[PDB]
Design an enzyme around this catalytic site. Structure first.
Site: not given
Ligand SMILES: O=c1ccn([C@@H]2O[C@H](COP(=O)(O)OP(=O)(O)O[C@H]3O[C@H](CO)[C@@H](O)[C@H](O)[C@H]3O)[C@@H](O)[C@H]2O)c(=O)[nH]1
Ligand SMILES: [Mn+2]
Ligand SMILES: O=c1ccn([C@@H]2O[C@H](COP(=O)(O)OP(=O)(O)O[C@H]3O[C@H](CO)[C@@H](O)[C@H](O)[C@H]3O)[C@@H](O)[C@H]2O)c(=O)[nH]1
Ligand SMILES: CCCCCCCCO[C@@H]1O[C@H](CO)[C@H](O)C[C@H]1O[C@@H]1O[C@@H](C)[C@@H](O)[C@@H](O)[C@@H]1O
Ligand SMILES: CCCCCCCCO[C@@H]1O[C@H](CO)[C@H](O)C[C@H]1O[C@@H]1O[C@@H](C)[C@@H](O)[C@@H](O)[C@@H]1O
Ligand SMILES: [Mn+2]
Lengths: 278, 278
Positions: B62-64, B143-145, B165, B177, B235
């Site tokens: 997802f890339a939003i 995740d995309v990041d 994790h 957590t 999560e």
């Molecule tokens: O504005 C945004 C925000 C999130 N994402 C998507 O959602 C993912 C998760 O968000 P991210 O900002 O990467 O959060 P993290 O803190 O890395 O996420 C961890 O924590 C989240 C719970 O808060 C879970 O949903 C995630 O999968 C887990 O990897 C991103 O990689 C994207 O794929 C978007 O596309 N646009």
């Molecule tokens: Mn992430």
């Protein structure tokens, strides 16, 4: 493979990622199949998983000619140790139905006597295919000249398993007694082989056991037509099959041991299923 | 699960029963699921097994909003490291289809842009159920990041997997957590829990991923109706699901790492899929 309901709440020790269960043995194959040793499994979790599927286990055993004498101890000890709490169907193949001992079974367990006149692989595949598919989820195929001494349970169940032969688990592959003649369907070159599996304990889902036994029977028939008999008969063919079709679990030699021949080494915490003098 | 043809002859090192691959880490869970670390698998054997089934892997991402910026590196590094040699279908879910970078793909690999307006679990289950069942054998949801730095291949594939994790693999369960409020569907008491799985890398067969995502979506909707949001959102629900439905493989933190935060500890031989600054 049916829909799996949720496990209930359970209290048990946390697995710790930086603490291996066993450090003295290989507990996973290079194709990511577990090798089943004591200390690698929580039987409470596994029992829950398999009971929630109402799993039925078939156990095949052949008792032909003088080997009917082994049935009483085999069956009585199976009642103490084999899949207790689960549904079990024993299939006793014999030339002497009247010599099958009257053994008292626990609830949810049944025994069928199948009269018969190499044969094992044919008899498991050809004759019993339809019956097993209707009656059980897994098949476990064992030698009769044996007794259960400790737990043998659902930790073994998987689509396809073999058991490490107790005489060869420490051997290098060149020492394995695979069939070495290229003229046999069971042929394995000196640079191939994962393990030496014992012919006396294999199993899996009904589908996978019927595949294995069909393939081994077909290969044995080819050898017979070509005037060759593999060095260790069905066991040679089983080894060829499991080389080419990797098992999804491998049982440690806990599951097929000979204490008179091999003692009780440090690496074996339990002796589960053991040879009786023959 | 279709008929599996025989593996060809292969020459590789013999697995040795009295030599563990890894002695520093747990390589199998107490429910007999492999924990995937470097040194536990022969990728040549696994590649053969999965190519013989003509396996197709779907990868959802997802890339939003601003996260479209992460796609170029994500996809270009996926081309270098993710399931190379296998059939791959990327599914890129975005609110900005025109911002998806034009990335050159290797043969047998394709990319679909799916326009969209919590959402991830719903979007994977509700909207894409039929498509995924027709198009791929396994789904991998990430995740995309992130970027791929090393091999991520068929060793991960199994009916259901989660990933340890990277911040919690050495933690005791009371420190996890998890959602701790009994009012949430994601609630896990302090005396329960195997692992803390990261929301950013899970997968399995299409059927099992649709089951997981449906259950998590349903549980999140219940929480919303009850005026509660789990501490770590999707999560928290993923963790509840995987506690009650044990994964059939667990990926080590090699598969989801943050080098800036956590360095490169001795227990990690490879850093495969890693956080990019956000
Ligand atoms: O504005 C945004 C925000 C999130 N994402 C998507 O959602 C993912 C998760 O968000 P991210 O900002 O990467 O959060 P993290 O803190 O890395 O996420 C961890 O924590 C989240 C719970 O808060 C879970 O949903 C995630 O999968 C887990 O990897 C991103 O990689 C994207 O794929 C978007 O596309 N646009
Ligand atoms: Mn992430
Ligand atoms: O007269 C006989 C001979 C054999 N059997 C059955 O066949 C099995 C195998 O024969 P056994 O005498 O137990 O031979 P082992 O040397 O223990 O057998 C090993 O070697 C054989 C290959 O030679 C494989 O078929 C076996 O499964 C493997 O355990 C027995 O347990 C019985 O189930 C009979 O019922 N009656
Ligand atoms: C005295 C007997 C020595 C047997 C040692 C090796 O075991 C034998 O290995 C063969 C393959 O090389 C084949 O599997 C038969 C197997 O012998 C059987 O299993 C042993 C563990 C003993 O129980 C033996 O009595 C039995 O015949
Ligand atoms: C500075 C950030 C510290 C984050 C440490 C713990 O990681 C976080 O754990 C949460 C559950 O307790 C949840 O999974 C989010 C997770 O943070 C993500 O993953 C980390 C490994 C970092 O990459 C972080 O930037 C990212 O937000
Ligand atoms: Mn025997």
């Amino acid at each position: 493979g049916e829909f799996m309901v949720s496990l209930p709440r359970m209290v048990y020790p946390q697995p710790k990622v930086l603490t291996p269960c066993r450090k003295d043995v290989l507990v996973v194959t290079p194709w990511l199949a577990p090798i089943v040793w004591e200390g690698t499994f929580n039987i409470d979790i596994l029992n829950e998983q398999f009971r929630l599927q109402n799993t039925t286990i078939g156990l095949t055993v052949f008792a032909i000619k003088k080997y009917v004498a082994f049935l009483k101890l085999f069956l009585e000890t199976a009642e103490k140790h084999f899949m207790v709490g689960h549904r079990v169907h024993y299939y006793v193949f014999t030339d002497q139905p009247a010599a099958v001992p009257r053994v008292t079974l626990g609830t949810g367990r049944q025994l069928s006597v199948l009269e018969v006149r190499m044969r094992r692989m044919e008899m498991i595949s050809d004759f019993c295919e339809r019956r097993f598919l209707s009656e059980v989820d897994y098949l476990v195929c064992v030698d009769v000249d044996m007794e259960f001494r400790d737990h043998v349970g659902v930790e073994i169940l998987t689509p396809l398993f073999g058991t490490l032969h107790p005489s060869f688990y420490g051997s290098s592959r060149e020492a394995f007694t695979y069939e070495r003649r290229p003229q046999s369907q069971a042929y394995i070159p000196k640079d191939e082989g994962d393990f030496y599996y014992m012919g006396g304990f294999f199993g899996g889902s009904v589908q996978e056991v019927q595949r294995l036994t069909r393939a081994c029977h077909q290969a044995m028939m080819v050898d017979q037509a070509n005037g060759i008999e593999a060095v260790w008969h069905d066991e040679s063919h089983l080894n060829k099959y499991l080389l080419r079709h990797k098992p999804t679990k491998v049982l440690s030699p806990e599951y097929l041991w000979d204490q008179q021949l091999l003692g009780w080494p440090a690496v074996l915490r339990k002796l589960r299923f053991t040879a009786v003098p023959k």
